[PDB]
Design an enzyme around this catalytic site. Structure first.
Site, mmCIF file in Angstrom:
data_model
loop_
_atom_site.group_PDB
_atom_site.id
_atom_site.type_symbol
_atom_site.label_atom_id
_atom_site.label_comp_id
_atom_site.label_asym_id
_atom_site.label_seq_id
_atom_site.Cartn_x
_atom_site.Cartn_y
_atom_site.Cartn_z
ATOM 1 N N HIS A 185 -10.220 -1.715 8.980
ATOM 2 C CA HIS A 185 -8.767 -1.401 8.850
ATOM 3 C C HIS A 185 -8.504 0.017 9.505
ATOM 4 O O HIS A 185 -9.397 0.784 9.597
ATOM 5 C CB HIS A 185 -8.250 -1.549 7.507
ATOM 6 N N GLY A 186 -7.285 0.323 9.978
ATOM 7 C CA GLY A 186 -6.865 1.590 10.626
ATOM 8 C C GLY A 186 -5.524 1.925 10.084
ATOM 9 O O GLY A 186 -4.711 0.989 10.024
ATOM 10 N N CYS A 207 -5.686 -1.405 13.344
ATOM 11 C CA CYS A 207 -4.343 -1.032 13.378
ATOM 12 C C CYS A 207 -4.022 0.452 13.724
ATOM 13 O O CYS A 207 -5.002 1.277 13.280
ATOM 14 C CB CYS A 207 -3.572 -1.392 12.267
ATOM 15 N N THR A 210 -7.830 -6.106 2.214
ATOM 16 C CA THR A 210 -8.455 -7.560 2.515
ATOM 17 C C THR A 210 -9.631 -7.668 3.267
ATOM 18 O O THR A 210 -9.832 -6.614 3.982
ATOM 19 C CB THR A 210 -7.306 -8.303 3.085
ATOM 20 N N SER A 211 -10.563 -8.550 3.031
ATOM 21 C CA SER A 211 -11.582 -8.680 3.894
ATOM 22 C C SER A 211 -11.287 -9.156 5.174
ATOM 23 O O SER A 211 -10.325 -9.919 5.364
ATOM 24 C CB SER A 211 -12.585 -9.903 3.157
#
Ligand SMILES: O=C(O)c1cc(S(=O)(=O)NCCS)ccc1O
Ligand SMILES: *CC(=O)[C@H](CC(=O)O)NC(=O)CS
Lengths: 146, 92
Positions: A93-94, A135, A34-35
């Site tokens: 993100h991660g 994350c 997601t953006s």
């Protein structure tokens, strides 16, 4: 000279150093990612905050996994002799040990290895700071009332 | 000789294994708090002490609100990982 203690890093080199900000907001479709609405607010806040600490800020937006690795490799190959420190901020993100390029994952170890004391000699003995907004997994902290 | 891993610091937004919160209009809890504490204290405090204030700010001032019970009323603690060998002051 008087008594000299070496308890703090020498931070009076001619330059404070680079602050590389990787701001990944928009991701490729097949990643299913997601953006990241709000990340530009973070990116601007960081650029201003580190500007006022006299860091040479470089913002990079929406980098692929390949572009992240290439950027870090290139940055680690600069001459940092006149710089006090190095800062890299990752906004993406991660998962544990992983940061996402727009097209897939990058191991954080791959990024930071470029700056090892034996691999970036002009940063040997200087603080290398990695600031990571991502994350590290999926667990949620329920908290406790005090 | 020094260790090749010496003089790194990781300022993670969250504990190992954990989710990290971001707001559409304010940004992430961690980055907003980090910038605030740097603004307020970078000319005053050693970096680990700034980051400790960031830990407290995130831990105390933020809690999620969600229509999905799974993601509601959640909290976050950032995680400082220091392999530094000296104190770090942004000023001299
Ligand atoms: O506190 C927040 O920042 C918050 C943010 C959201 S969100 O929908 O803007 N982001 C969560 C998924 S990226 C939802 C609930 C929240 O409490
Ligand atoms: C799980 C994640 O990697 C991201 C990190 C981010 O800052 O976007 N967190 C979320 O998507 C929850 S807002």
């Amino acid at each position: 000279s008087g008594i000299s203690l070496d308890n703090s890093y020498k931070m009076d080199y001619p330059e404070m150093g680079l602050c590389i900000i990787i701001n990944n907001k928009n991701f490729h479709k097949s990643t299913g990612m997601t953006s990241r609405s709000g990340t530009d607010v973070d990116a601007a806040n960081l650029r201003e905050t580190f500007r006022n600490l006299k860091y040479e800020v470089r913002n990079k937006n929406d980098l692929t996994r390949e572009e992240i690795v290439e950027l870090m490799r290139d940055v680690s190959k600069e001459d940092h002799s006149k710089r006090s420190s190095f800062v890299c901020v990752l906004l993406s993100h991660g998962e544990e040990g992983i940061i996402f390029g727009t097209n897939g994952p990058v191991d954080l170890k791959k990024i930071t290895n470029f700056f090892r004391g034996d691999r970036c000699r002009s940063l040997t003995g200087k603080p290398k700071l990695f600031i990571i907004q991502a994350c590290r997994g999926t667990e949620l902290d329920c908290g406790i009332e005090t | 000789k020094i260790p090749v891993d010496a003089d790194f610091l990781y300022a993670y937004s969250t504990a190992p294994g954990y989710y990290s919160w971001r707001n559409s209009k304010d940004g992430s809890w961690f980055i907003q708090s980090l910038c605030a504490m740097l603004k307020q204290y970078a000319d005053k405090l050693e970096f680990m002490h700034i980051l400790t204030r960031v830990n407290r700010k995130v831990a105390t001032e933020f809690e999620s609100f969600s229509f999905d019970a799974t993601f509601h009323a959640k909290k976050q603690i950032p995680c400082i990982v220091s392999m530094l060998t000296k104190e770090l002051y942004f000023y001299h």
